[PDB]
Homo-oligomer: A and B are copies of this chain.
Amino acid sequence: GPLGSARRLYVGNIPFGITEEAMMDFFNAQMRLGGLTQAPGNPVLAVQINQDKNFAFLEFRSVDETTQAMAFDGIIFQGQSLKIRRPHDYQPLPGAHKLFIGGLPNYLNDDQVKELLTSFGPLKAFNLVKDSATGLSKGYAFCEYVDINVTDQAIAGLNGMQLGDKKLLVQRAS
């Protein structure tokens, strides 16, 4: 981004032979029947198809409607479960999905704590808070996953779970 790609969605696994027009009517219709539309008129302004690789990019009129349409991820359209994602170029703003990791054993080093988190997917940021005078760990860390949907799954996979004699706390750092 940082602000680029705000009003477009990738749509994967589109039906064979489908038209930009039918795609448009379909997503326009869903936005309306789902009550995700936030004003009179069509939220999707345009649809670009790559017939060869079977995906499309939707172009929305507004920022929030782009986000809401993500709730259609999975929707079946002519027998086909659509894969709806953000454009590759789209980034959330830094520390939007920053995580707190509490209840880590204090003898474990950076790489060793990273291991637990890297399990769920790659990180764009991480820091295990230490006592700088000694170098010894305080038992808590912060991180951010590169893919951003990974954030919730790491919480579900770690929050409240057991790690030694301690119980891990994983949550949005705000």
A53 on the interface (CB 8 Å rule)? yes
Contact of A16 among B52, B53, B79, B95 (CB under 8 A): B95
A33 on the interface (CB 8 Å rule)? no
Alpha-carbon separation in the docked complex, A29 to B15 (Å): 33
Known contacts A3-B16, A16-B3, A16-B98; A79/B53 CB under 8 A: no
Q: List 6 tightest A-B contacts by C-beta distance, closest first.
A: A16-B95, A16-B94, A3-B17, A52-B127, A17-B94, A53-B127
Knowing that A53-B127, A53-B129 touch, tell me 11 more A-B residue pairs with CB under 8 angstroms.
A3-B16, A3-B17, A15-B95, A16-B94, A16-B95, A16-B98, A17-B63, A17-B94, A17-B95, A52-B127, A79-B93
